Amino acid sequence: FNKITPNLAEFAFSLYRQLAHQSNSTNIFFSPVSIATAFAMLSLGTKADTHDEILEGLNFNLTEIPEAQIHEGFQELLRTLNQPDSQLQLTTGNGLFLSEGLKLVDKFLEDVKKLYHSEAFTVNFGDTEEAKKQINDYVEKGTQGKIVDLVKELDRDTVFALVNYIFFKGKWERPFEVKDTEEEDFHVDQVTTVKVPMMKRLGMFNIQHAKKLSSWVLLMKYLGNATAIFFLPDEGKLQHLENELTHDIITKFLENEDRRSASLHLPKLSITGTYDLKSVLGQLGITKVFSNGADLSGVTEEAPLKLSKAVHKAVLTIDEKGTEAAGADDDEAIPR
Amino acid sequence: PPEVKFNKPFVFLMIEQNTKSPLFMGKVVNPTQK
């Protein structure tokens, strides 16, 4: 367990709750790790309370872990993520798109290269189409066609665009047989039932009851170093579940290896999440980096910059064979 | 053998085995919705 894992998990729940409160009755999907990676990278070039709001916003605590080790945590994290088991497919990458003539701070450039395996690119944001073409392509290649046109409109004054992505392609340890997939009712709300292709398999599963969540937890094992956890809340206990999630509670689960006999019904699915995180990140405490008081002098000492837009998009596909997922971050900086 | 059925809104997590980091998280409220 990576030293910085607990925090990443607490960021996930913190962020998830903001998102579920922003839109109450819609599908959600994002990549906590991806978002955390882009912003931890960003902080490197920030200072003062601009820098601290980001680290604290990511659920980090400087009294619990020294800053040097935090980045060092990400460094190993990205390294590990990019070293999956033969049977699993998983990649994550970081590209830093810097405008032409921008006088970067030597340290920042070297820090992002070493600690975040960031690739520096030079692009002219004045040639909007060209600028877009380059970013979306880098994203598309990283997400193997899963995430296209992450950027539809790019502002001409953009000074730099921090772009991050995660690609995932895992296979079920024990997959479903297509022939068992039949259409079933999905209960959306009191008066809304809908037919959806529902996969099913009879077998031994890791199924535990979490009273503290008033939910049942299902553990699906991927071939390799991946696992998916599904939470099925008791009647009327959805909000309670979202509210009660914590890292400790989860960690305790995976600690239980007891399997049981069951007939699992899991919905084949295809959901896409597209967000502007500027608002939800504000609720987390991250505001100054988006404001006229933002301090990005760590990235450049000539002009004062600021982040104007925090774009995140993630795509999830789940079927009989396993799961494919992609996540990508687009954080754009402009003169403050 | 009991039927465990994800036919109502539910939450989930995709975890990396080694680091234990949350690669993905989502909520399904309605499959036919993306």
The total of other beta-carbon atoms located within 10 Å of residue A99's CB is 17
Q: Which CATH architecture has domain A1-172+268-336?
A: 2-Layer Sandwich (3.30)
Q: What are phi and psi of A291, to 5 degrees?
A: -110, 170
Asked if residues A319 and A304 have their Cβ atoms less than 8 Å apart, the reply is no
As a whole number of angstroms, the distance between CA B9 and CA B7 comes to 7
Kindly state whether A48 is in contact with chain B, defined as any CB-CB distance less than 8 angstroms: no
The Cα–Cα gap between A190 and A209 comes to 25
CA–CA dist A96, A122 (Å, integer): 8
The domains of chain A are located at 1-172+268-336, 173-267
Q: Which residue has the tokens 């990508």?
A: A328
Amino acid identity of A305?
A: L
How far is Cα A232 from Cα A250, in angstroms, rounded to an integer? 14
Residue A280: phi and psi, rounded to 5, are -65, -30
- Asked whether A139 and A165 are in contact (CB, 8 A), the reply is yes
Q: Say whether A166 and B34 touch across the interface (CB within 8 A).
A: no
Q: Distance between CA atoms of A142 and A139, rounded to whole angstroms?
A: 5
To 5 degrees, how large is the angle CA A301–CA A304–CA A308? 135
DSSP state of A129: H
Span between the terminal Cα atoms of chain A, in Å: 39
Residue A19, token pair as written in the block: 């998102």
* Chain centre distance of CA A28: 12
B11, A323: Cβ pair inside 8 Å?
A: no
- Bin A214: left if φ > 0, else alpha if -120 < ψ < 50, else beta: left
Could you say which of B11, B18, B20 has the minimum Cβ distance to residue A231? B11
Question: In whole angstroms, how far apart are CA A153 and each of A101, A129, A266?
Answer: 22, 9, 37
Residues 81-100 of chain A with CB under 8 A from chain B are 81, 90
For chain B, how far is it from start to end, CA to CA, in angstroms? 31
| Rounded Cα–Cα distance for residues B27 and B34 (Å) | 11
Measure CA A21 to chain center: 18
Token pair of A218 as six digits: 């299902």
> Sign (positive/negative) of CA torsion A49, A79, A218, A206?
negative
- In our burial notation (b when 16+ CB lie closer than 10 A, e otherwise), range A187-209 reads ebeeeeeeebebbbbeeebbbbe
Tallying the residues shown for chain A, one arrives at: 336
Is the CB of A194 inside 8 Å of chain B's CB atoms?
A: yes
**Across the strands, what pairs with B5?**
A265
Instruction: Report which of A126, A169, A166 is spatially closest to residue A150, judged by C-alpha positions.
Output: A166
Backbone angles phi, psi at A190, to 5 degrees: -50, -45
Experimental method of this PDB entry: X-ray
Contacts of B24 in chain A (CB under 8 A): 29-32, 168, 314, 316, 325, 327
> What is the Cα–Cα distance from A168 to A146, expressed in whole angstroms?
10
Contacts of A49 (CB under 8 A, 6+ apart): A288
CB within 8 Å of A252: residues ≥ 6 apart:
none
CB A120 within 8 A of CB A96: yes
* C-beta of residue A225 within 8 angstroms of C-beta of residue A85: yes
CA distance A213 to A197: 28
Residue with tokens 């909007």: A128
CATH number of A173-267: 2.30.39.10
Angle between helices A5-22 and A247-254 (to 10 degrees): 120
